[PDB]
Design an enzyme around this catalytic site. Structure first.
Site, mmCIF file in Angstrom:
data_model
loop_
_atom_site.group_PDB
_atom_site.id
_atom_site.type_symbol
_atom_site.label_atom_id
_atom_site.label_comp_id
_atom_site.label_asym_id
_atom_site.label_seq_id
_atom_site.Cartn_x
_atom_site.Cartn_y
_atom_site.Cartn_z
ATOM 1 N N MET A 110 7.804 -12.410 24.511
ATOM 2 C CA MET A 110 7.594 -11.814 25.829
ATOM 3 C C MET A 110 6.528 -12.567 26.624
ATOM 4 O O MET A 110 6.736 -12.900 27.791
ATOM 5 C CB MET A 110 7.226 -10.335 25.711
ATOM 6 C CG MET A 110 7.085 -9.615 27.049
ATOM 7 S SD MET A 110 5.472 -9.848 27.843
ATOM 8 C CE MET A 110 4.486 -8.713 26.870
ATOM 9 N N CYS A 167 16.887 -0.781 42.056
ATOM 10 C CA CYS A 167 16.578 -1.896 42.970
ATOM 11 C C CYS A 167 17.468 -1.911 44.211
ATOM 12 O O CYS A 167 17.150 -2.569 45.188
ATOM 13 C CB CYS A 167 16.665 -3.258 42.258
ATOM 14 S SG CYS A 167 15.510 -3.457 40.898
ATOM 15 N N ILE A 179 17.201 -4.378 30.468
ATOM 16 C CA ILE A 179 17.638 -5.377 31.431
ATOM 17 C C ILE A 179 18.640 -6.284 30.751
ATOM 18 O O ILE A 179 18.279 -7.006 29.827
ATOM 19 C CB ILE A 179 16.458 -6.245 31.892
ATOM 20 C CG1 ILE A 179 15.292 -5.369 32.376
ATOM 21 C CG2 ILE A 179 16.901 -7.221 32.974
ATOM 22 C CD1 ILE A 179 15.624 -4.533 33.585
ATOM 23 N N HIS A 228 21.891 0.557 40.543
ATOM 24 C CA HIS A 228 22.466 1.008 39.269
ATOM 25 C C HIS A 228 23.933 1.409 39.439
ATOM 26 O O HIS A 228 24.403 1.602 40.565
ATOM 27 C CB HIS A 228 21.659 2.162 38.666
ATOM 28 C CG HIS A 228 20.334 1.743 38.112
ATOM 29 N ND1 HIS A 228 20.214 1.035 36.935
ATOM 30 C CD2 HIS A 228 19.073 1.929 38.571
ATOM 31 C CE1 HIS A 228 18.935 0.796 36.697
ATOM 32 N NE2 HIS A 228 18.222 1.333 37.673
#
Ligand SMILES: CC(C)(COP(=O)(O)OP(=O)(O)OC[C@H]1O[C@@H](n2cnc3c(N)ncnc32)[C@H](O)[C@@H]1OP(=O)(O)O)[C@@H](O)C(=O)NCCC(=O)NCCS
Ligand SMILES: CC(C)(COP(=O)(O)OP(=O)(O)OC[C@H]1O[C@@H](n2cnc3c(N)ncnc32)[C@H](O)[C@@H]1OP(=O)(O)O)[C@@H](O)C(=O)NCCC(=O)NCCS
Lengths: 377, 372
Positions: free
Chosen positions: B38, B142, B254, B360
């Site tokens: 990460m 988003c 994601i 979404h």
């Protein structure tokens, strides 16, 4: 031209949650405490004859030793709530008589689920709505959500009328509050704060189809009511009169004792504002008399109906369909106003005589009264 | 015509740079493969700055426990709502009109759930009139900036139909860093690398829209007209992004395929937008992406690249989109507004402008705006 309601349907959950059932659930998991005994005592005085849950008496939800996690609460809404919503939506579309891929707008509402994607997206796929259907999922409004959805859809449809094109809106309300019943019981035991939410709420989905009247097809039901105007009023206030606050195991309800009092003060003001903002009615003094209208009021509780009834100069018989929905179904949050419209619709089909104009009213969060005026065509 | 007449945004004030994130992570977790992966990805996002409402010394980054959902909600109320009222006030200032003449409020967030929602609080803070018509959108993520514009656009057309003035305040408020502690803990426990840790930042942004009826001298003239908005939901078993509720907030998933899907779907989404726009649907030139200006929600760097290539655009065409992403990162529903702001500021470009963003339910929200 005008926006009309052309389809109506509702579907309560199938399993009774009567006073005996709630008592058996409560005493299964908790020892007698004064808050438990007061809640159960109040439960038997709600004057709700039936309310319903998606969870049968033998379901593990009522027997498990642990409180459902929030993730479990989500999965439960998906497993039980969405099919209830799909059924109610399908039945409203059936009542309308048109075809699913001719729905242009979807306006959905719940306060018993939070998800990304929201349940509106799932519904589009299950109902076979067109790929460019225009979705809206309302949040933060609670019991005002049925009327809130009608308000939004009403204006969206007027926007299509502005462009001269057909618009057909599916409104879908889906509430599964018994999902949180285990969490609420546990909170009430731990804090000894009596929570009347335990006593009032039940599970249900309901739907409307609205049309802007452009491009009407012979297969479509003619207008049941026209929607003339919708007008919200937010009243001054320190805090909200109801809260549904997020926490680790779901949402927790806080129901203020002052709701019936505030209902008596505010509903007449709300109604006055509705009429004054309706140009075709605002001028004449008789239009400001509540008894000149039919009424549908969201029955947050029995005392809420009483408060509105008295403050508006009405009789209990004026609010018969509102008492009936409350008595058989209980408080089903955003879906309740739709269940009342269905009752009113069904009574008219049976020769009953009703006024030409009909006022809807319901409390929503932020101390906001949602109202609408409907007219017989 | 419905027009945009005010624009403003406000990122949170405290940098969350690579060094800062690493310091937070190593403060609470011993090294693991997913942690190192990460952090390695984090330095390759090509985000130069993103921001949090939480300073380096804030207890949020030092407390030994993961915040409860109730705490996460309180945090949004404490830091997020003031950010939203600042952005809203500044957009109203940009507009020039007065607060009690706002007719509609369209709000959106995916980093808070509350009853009442944050929209109600804003009405009181901004002194909106008691009959302001509020909507709080949910479930969209988003895509929410464009979704809000789509909704407000049609509502205002509805007032045009009735021949009355309408002014809509659109407000997006996102505080994803509230959930950073929970996400870190989940990544540690599962060893599932979560790139959400690397992309997202806190911000609020606002627009004022007008239906042009009852225009007052004090009001700013139209910046763009909104011609049409068109969402397309694409086929698919599961969503390409999830933000799933759990005991300590929301957890982001994601999908790796987002950039690939972006290349496939964006051109289709664009085609549907134009074909649904009566005044453009007929001329074949209107189906050429390079004949438009573009603003695209930068879900990630590779998302921008995917759209750029599939649309036949250049990186310079998407300059404002790259810039927002580079300085601010992915601020969810607020990002498209930050891009409109940059575009407005640069102007102070082509005649038409297309907005696009993933929401979404594998749904692409789009809008076409025109110069007045
Ligand atoms: C709950 C209800 C059905 C009880 O009916 P009732 O017995 O005729 O009403 P009473 O005034 O006799 O109330 C009886 C008890 O309920 C309690 N009670 C009423 N409202 C309460 C609330 N919001 N929270 C906690 N307790 C409540 C009273 O304190 C009283 O307690 P007591 O017996 O120790 O004095 C009725 O009061 C009601 O409908 N209230 C409105 C509920 C509401 O606000 N609904 C909206 C939800 S958003
Ligand atoms: C994250 C990102 C900035 C990395 O940039 P990059 O290093 O140039 O891209 P690369 O293809 O070299 O990816 C490098 C690593 O990131 C990993 N990665 C990329 N996307 C990932 C995702 N969605 N989840 C988990 N890991 C991911 C790759 O597997 C790769 O791992 P490896 O180096 O161990 O093989 C870029 O892949 C991106 O922007 N992706 C889009 C993110 C997205 O979909 N955002 C939308 C949010 S809704």
């Amino acid at each position: 031209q005008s926006v009309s309601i052309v389809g109506i349907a509702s579907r309560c959950a199938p399993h009774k949650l009567g006073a005996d059932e709630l008592e058996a659930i409560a005493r299964r998991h908790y020892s007698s405490t004064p808050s438990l005994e007061k809640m159960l005592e109040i439960n038997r005085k709600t004057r709700i004859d039936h309310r319903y849950s998606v969870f049968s008496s033998d379901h593990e939800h009522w027997h498990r030793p642990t409180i459902p996690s929030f993730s479990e609460c989500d999965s439960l809404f998906k497993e039980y709530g969405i099919p209830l919503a799909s059924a109610a939506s399908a039945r409203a579309i059936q009542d309308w008589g048109g075809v699913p891929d001719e729905i242009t707008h979807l306006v959905a509402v719940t306060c018993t689920n939070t998800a990304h994607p929201g349940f509106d997206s799932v519904l589009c796929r299950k109902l076979g709505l067109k790929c460019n259907v225009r979705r809206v999922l309302l949040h933060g409004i609670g019991c005002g959500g049925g009327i809130s959805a009608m308000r939004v859809a009403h204006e969206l449809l007027l926007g299509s009328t502005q462009q001269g094109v057909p618009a057909r809106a599916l409104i879908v309300a889906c509430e599964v509050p018994t999902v949180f019943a285990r969490s609420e019981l546990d909170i009430m035991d731990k804090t000894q704060d009596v929570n009347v939410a335990m006593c009032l709420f039940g599970d249900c989905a309901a739907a409307l189809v609205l049309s802007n009247g452009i491009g009407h097809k012979a297969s479509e039901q003619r207008p049941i009511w026209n929607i003339l105007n919708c007008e919200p009023t937010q009243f001054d206030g320190t805090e909200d009169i109801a809260h549904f606050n997020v926490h680790d195991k779901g949402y927790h309800a806080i129901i203020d004792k002052r709701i019936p009092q505030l209902t008596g003060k505010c509903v007449p003001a709300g109604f006055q504002s509705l009429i004054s903002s309706t140009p075709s009615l605002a001028l004449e003094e008789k239009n400001y008399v509540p008894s000149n209208y039919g009424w549908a009021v969201h029955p947050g509780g029995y005392a809420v109906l009483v408060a509105a009834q008295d403050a508006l100069g009405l009789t209990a018989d004026d609010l018969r369909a509102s008492y009936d929905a409350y008595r058989d179904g209980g408080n089903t949050i955003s879906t309740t106003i739709i269940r009342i419209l269905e009752k009113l619709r069904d009574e008219h089909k049976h020769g009953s005589n009703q006024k030409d104009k009909l006022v809807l009213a319901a409390w929503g969060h932020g101390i906001t009264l949602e109202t609408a005026i409907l007219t017989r065509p």
